[PDB]
Amino acid sequence: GSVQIVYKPVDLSKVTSKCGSLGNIHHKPGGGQVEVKSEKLDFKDRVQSKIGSLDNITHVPGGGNKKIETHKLTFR
Amino acid sequence: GSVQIVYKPVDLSKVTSKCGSLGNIHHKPGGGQVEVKSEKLDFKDRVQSKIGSLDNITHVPGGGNKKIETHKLTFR
Amino acid sequence: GSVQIVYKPVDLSKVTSKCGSLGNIHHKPGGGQVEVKSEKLDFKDRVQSKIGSLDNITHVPGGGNKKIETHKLTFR
Amino acid sequence: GSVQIVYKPVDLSKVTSKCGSLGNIHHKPGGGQVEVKSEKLDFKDRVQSKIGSLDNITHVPGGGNKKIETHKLTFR
Amino acid sequence: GSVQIVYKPVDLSKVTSKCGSLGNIHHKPGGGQVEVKSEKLDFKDRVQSKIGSLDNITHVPGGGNKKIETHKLTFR
Amino acid sequence: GSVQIVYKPVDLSKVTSKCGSLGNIHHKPGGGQVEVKSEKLDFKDRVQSKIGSLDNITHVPGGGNKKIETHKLTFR
Fold this sequence. Notes:
Organism (chains A, B, C, D, E, F): Homo sapiens
Protein name (chains A, B, C, D, E, F): Microtubule-associated protein tau
Distance between the termini of chain A: 16 Å
Tau/MAP repeats (chains A, B, C, D, E, F): 3-33, 34-65
Number of helices of chain A: 0
Oligomer: homohexamer
Site (Not glycated) (chains A, B, C, D, E, F): 8, 14, 18, 28, 37, 40, 67, 72
Strand content of chain A: over 45%
Subcellular location (chains A, B, C, D, E, F): Cytoplasm, Cytosol; Cell membrane; Cytoplasm, Cytoskeleton; Cell projection, Axon
């Protein structure tokens, strides 16, 4: 008794966009006033600390369209 | 007896957009006044701490259309 | 007994964009006022610390489209 | 017996004026039409006139900003 | 017996004026039509006039901002 | 017994004027049309006119910014 596996996915899909213009985009975050008082700061394992810091991303792609696809055949 | 597995997904999907413009986009977060008083800050494993900090994203894709598709086949 | 695995995915898929212009994009984050006081700062493993710092990304691709396509085939 | 004076006023304030025609969106506006018939014109003394205008005038004598700070410390 | 004075006022205030034609959306507005028949004009003395106008005037003499601060510490 | 004066006023404040026609979007606007018939013109004394205008005038006599600070530490 044979085993025959015919994995033939067919994809003709279109992922598209038409955009007339991307305009006046203004990312302007402002920090506050931040005061930390202690005798000790004591950070011991896998600690992430953000005191008064700003992390900023401005991502403006003319398309930014994504096709994400996965194929997985397992035989045992 | 023999085993025959036929895997023929057919895909003609359209994932589209038409846009006249992406406009006047303002992203202006403001911090406040933040005061922390202590004898000790003592962080001992896998601690995330954000004192008066700002994390900011401005994401303005002209399309931003996503097609996401997982195919999995298993035989044992 | 015989085994016959045929793996013939077919992709004709289109990922596209049309954009008329990417315009006046302003990324102007401002730091706050940040005051940290102690007798000791004591950081001991896998510590990330951000005091009053700014991390900025400006990313403006004319397309920025992605086609991600993992193929896997395991036989045992 | 001692004197300690700390003079640390912090200013993060904003003074802003926005005048006169900002941040508008016009999407596919039709073309305006103007017609005038006036064969014989006589303008004598101190005359100011417009005939058949289609003008998008913005006029801003205003919108000025004035910030004053005094910071006095007197010790005797 | 000792004196400690901390003079540490924090200002995060916003003063803002917004004038006169801001933040509108006009979507597919029709084209306006203006027609005038007036064959013979005589304007004699100190006349100010318009004929057949389709103007979108904005005029802002106002909208100014005045911020005054006095910070004053006297020790004797 | 001693005197310690710390004079550390901090300014991060902003003064901004925005005048007169900023950040507008015009997407696929139609062309405006102007017609005037006026064969015979006589303009004599101090006359000012426009005939058949289609003008995007922006006029800003205003929008000035004035900042004053006085800092004064007196010891006796």
